[model samples]
Target chain A: HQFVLTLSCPSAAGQVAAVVGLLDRHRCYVDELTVFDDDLSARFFVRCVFHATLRVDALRREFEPIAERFRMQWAIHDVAARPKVLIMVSKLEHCLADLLFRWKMGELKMDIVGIVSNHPDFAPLAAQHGLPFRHFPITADTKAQQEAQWLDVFETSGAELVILARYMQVLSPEASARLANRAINIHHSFLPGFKGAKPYHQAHARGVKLIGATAHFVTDDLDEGPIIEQVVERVDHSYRPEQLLAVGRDVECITLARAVKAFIERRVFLNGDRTVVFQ
Target chain B: PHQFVLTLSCPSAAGQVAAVVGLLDRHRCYVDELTVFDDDLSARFFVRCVFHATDLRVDALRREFEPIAERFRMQWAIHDVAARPKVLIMVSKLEHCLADLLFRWKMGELKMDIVGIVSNHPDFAPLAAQHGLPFRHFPITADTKAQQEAQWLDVFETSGAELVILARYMQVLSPEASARLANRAINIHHSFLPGFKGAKPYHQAHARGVKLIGATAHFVTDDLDEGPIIEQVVERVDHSYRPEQLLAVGRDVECITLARAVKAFIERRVFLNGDRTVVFQ
Candidate 1:
């Protein structure tokens, strides 16, 4: 049976050997291992996968001692168990649409808990996948009330991660804190070049030659968080505003999908305000 | 503030990481990044570290680090990467790569000191002149290839070019020239190697019904296109793409591929390992 081990701790010597030696002693065959020692942050992150001889119970109990010594934030995931992901979207559907396609293709290996939205636009779209669609419409008055239900839906679905596939709402600071690093969002950014409504149009008016999308963990600050991945495509001056939006959509899907995939694979580690995504 | 980089390669052994970190810590420098990799197949370790040295001069730092480097039997260099390396651009009539390099350089995305642009033809002299670069044209004859290479080598030596970018350079260097340039020169192969050899490659590719069109940026060697690849960029095409469309795709991929390879080299991220390269991007 295969299992994955991921851990992060303050950078120190003998940590690599400790993990490897423990696995080796258990007659585990390491399938893949990647490590990062962030000098600036003085932290170490490891993602290791192996075929193990022992059961999960004994393996986890044995790891606790080593984990405590390093003061590591760690987890041991069995390969057979899929992470549960709840996707949220609003009026826009391309980002949500791309995710479903990838999930169907087995490119994203996760159980779709359900689809949550603040609008009812996607209920039929959700039914296309035979998924439960929960709508929590929010006005200025019901905003807080709606967000609480959103959390309830997440907990009830037993979601391990949240994917804001172009969800239009700016989560309040309270809700943002509750979700924290578990929520991922995708959106267009020319950033430092063009931002705020109709970024592509702004870029077009300025004759910008490149367009991109960013995927990041949700923080209280609107769309400004630890970036997980960014993808870009070069366009010539001939591309009009409409064409730029098409390119924008292309990057959005790619960046968000890759980020979510990396997170599900347990290859993403949050270090301070940035993400280390091992490819 | 002095920004310094330490790039090293050595055989895998215990205490290597500890030794290097101890050196940095003892020196009291603030490390910005410390990347390490131990290749299981080759049993070799590679590291690229960036640090802010508040007061330590490069010469003094190198002297203090020599003992640990020798103890580990490592190949290492401690240099200030903030000082961009001088580069000589060698181009032919092809303008795609040359134009893109110039564009990226002007954009400040690529940090390098352009010594000059060397060419076999006089086509780009005005272009070079416009960029305030000296253009040296050394046209090659059938038997004058050796003489031309000598002249170019002279330019390289005189200008103190730390790198030579063969941006779509049409001529193939002799084994001696390649050996002299060694890892200093990078060449962009216009098409995917081991497929569609010789001239009119895109046409051949179109004829053969190719799906992916790409470019390879590699260190120049006597092995020609078989050199260690540093970066590759590709785009998928289908039956709809004509030869011209494929060629357009080729230009985009080639420009991107060369640009990325050059950026990686300038950043001291590409390490030569066995017949391959490990790039810490």
Candidate 2:
């Protein structure tokens, strides 16, 4: 079995060796590993891919006893099994469209159950792929009832993860609490600045030299969450805000698709405010 | 003003950045780029400093810093800013990486001199000759490996070569020769590092159904690809990309990664630390 495990802890010595030792003791062959330490943040990250001859359930059951003592959060997955993912989107469909293309080509090991949206925009595009499109319109008055409907659909359709691919409507606090750890969102800013809306336009107004996209777990704080993946593209002052917006779309699509794949494959582990991404 | 650099690693603690910056400021060196990585896991700190050589004298600065460097157990080098590192490239038939690097150098995208090209096969001799570069064909067999290595060493020493680049050179170096080259050589490992260290890495990545395929440029050490990674570039790969298709995509990454690493090394922005790299790019 080939699985990727990512974990994070406070900066400490012998932590990596301890984790690797446990895997080795369990007869898991370490394939690739990367560690990053942010001195400014005082945090540590570890991403490791390994292979084991044991079944995933047995492997998890056997390792839980050891992992409990370290107080580490880990997810076990078989790489061969492609999980099903439900994509939710609004009017903007570039990210949704690209994900469907990649998923259709089998680049991503996940099935797109359908497209769920509060608005009916891009329903025809979903129909083009022969995927069912559920248009559940929501306004401020029916927000809670709308969210409950979305959750009911997710559970009924057996979606392992819900990817908000450029879905413009921000989840209300009640909705976010329910979808915690189960929903991933893509924010089209470098993040931590000009984050609310029209980030590319805001970045251009600020004369930014770099524009980026951030994909992360959706929380009540809006864009601020455990960032899972990010990809930045270079921009110059010569470009207008709209031009920046246009150029940033490619990077947004790439990072969003990457984050979705990482989430579905269980290669991303959230540790408080940060993420351990195994790539 | 000439911009030069020095990178070193020491036991982890505070004041490392202060000590290095203090030296530069005192010597009247204009700081340009500075980066520090304190690997809390390994209890080691790495620092790379790039500064303009204004009124500071190189030899005098090193003489003053040697005592402190020794105290820190530092492995370091002070490199000249404008010096063009001599490169002897090894290519076994594939010319994409070779061609890209040569073109980039000619286009001033890379700041280095490709002194010559060497190959174990005679196929690429004409390609080298077309560039008006010195071409050598040193075919190696089990019987003539020693003799081949002797000729290769002669080229290395006589041509004033600073680095050996394996731009898709399909031959594996002997442990002895790999040790000799050490950090003085760079290789473009197709498909990523720690994945397919030996051969046909693109195929292996495709079979594993990885969504991304990458190329890593690293120093050549005895442990094969367990060397310090200087730069890496990856492309999104999907099942639509067949084995051969993945090879095509990998070529672009391979060429760019190798060129970037070589350029960084030539600019004195690469520092080797055991089996890791601190690249300030």
Candidate 3:
């Protein structure tokens, strides 16, 4: 029952029937299933959580041929094990607070081993969750040192996943290389589109009709990374920058929460430039 | 004792509504719901009406009203509410809308006769069979355009299909064929109209630093994505979504929006007042 399967692949014939068939053949019952196929991009994506009477090892050993035949990029994991999570943040309390709440609610399904912050703000919020909070203040002069100190925490905590819950600072190339696919970040706007400070203000100024927030795997290229999950809500010119910021905050939280949930649940698979979330 | 609905959209002019209402009134049809929209900018008019009858025959009603319909040169449809007009769904390879529609149909959220599916390939033929539905694959090439359509037309005629849905059919419908469908067809445009029209709309949004993406369910006109829109569902986005990412996120919106609009159109809840639409719940 703990098995999870994720899918992200090019559009093909019989993809869904294949996956569903595989599950059915294994006697696995799908608990959570979501699929998205982009006709415009000619891409197919799926996420599925299932319970199998078969042993995890036994199911994997059986499904290899089918998986190889489809040229499918996938992963299967046990959902019950708690992975160690290391969180980094700036002054933002919304992302920090919400992640803490999920950890407290047992919704994250991960251990909040420690938190690294560049500001003192919301240190209390982290502490209240019985999570250790580390404040490594950063300035132009202390940027390298700050990251070094944060890395020390990351290394000591045995963190399997590093989450930038609104971490304002960009990752150094070394840090990004070290963490690779293990680190994730929440961006206020769709990245590589709107980058830099005051993204909501920038978004509002453009008079764009829809606003969105994204959560993605961290990489060296600031906001350019493999997106894990994203959400968007419509708005108009009547919403000022500050109000847009508020809405963006809500969007970021929801997107981050879903990303964290899926990531820890092992429901996200990176397929080229995009992700396959097996919801 | 059954219900039926009718919708008509064409060039705007006086008495279009009167002619329609007058015909129905003369036929002793009791109108329960009526709505209309006329888009001044496009000089187009759209109207929808739902009526009930315990004893009136649908063919008699249509036969009686055919002359008036010809007088206005209106693109029109008239069907019994229970007859569940045959819908010919066309898709290339995408199946989100197909799956969502099937699920909704199973749940009775969608009320219609899904007569058969038309695809360029047989990718979803099995899925069609799973639903106990018929599937036809009519592939097309530059030379086989007429032949391909001839096959589809046969299905339409045999199935007595009243509507055609270009769910995600990638081909640009020919002018002649589009004329044949006219107002009896609906297409789901992946992005908001007047924003991203042709090609990868989600990619256009991402590249332009656009913030939101919308799905518009509108009549398929020779004008491609431009037509009298029946429904629009929009979701926000920003820099977070890459071009490809936005497309993935758009599947749900496209499915839900198209399904609802198709339902509204078939149920006589959408009316054409002008170039725009008057949609009633």
After superposing all C-alphas onto the true structure, candidate 3 shows an RMSD in angstroms of 13.1
TM-scores of the models, in the order given: 0.68, 0.51, 0.48
lDDT of 2 by residue, A88-207 (tens): 988887899899899889888787887899889888898888998999998769878987888888889988789998887768787787778778888666544785667777787788
Question: Per-model i-RMS in Å?
Answer: 5.8, 13.1, 10.4
How high is the lDDT of residue A224 in model 3?
Answer: 62
Candidate 3 ranges with C-alpha deviation above 4 Å: A5-76, A190-199, A202-209, A221-223, B1-212, B215-281
Q: Is candidate 1 or candidate 2 better by TM-score?
A: 1
What is the clash tally of candidate 2?
0
Assess each model's interface with DockQ, reporting 2 decimals per model: 0.12, 0.03, 0.02
Per-residue CA lDDT of model 1 for B33-124, tens digit only, reads 66777787998888887877534656766887888889989998877877888999999999999999998888899989999999999999
Q: Who is ahead in TM-score, 2 or 3?
A: 2
Chain A accuracy of model 1 expressed as TM-score = 0.96
Q: Candidate 2 chain B: minimum summed lDDT over ten consecutive residues — where? A: B13-22
Best candidate according to DockQ: 1
CA RMSD, predictions in order: 6.6, 13.7, 13.1
Q: State the DockQ, from 0 to 1, for candidate 2.
A: 0.03
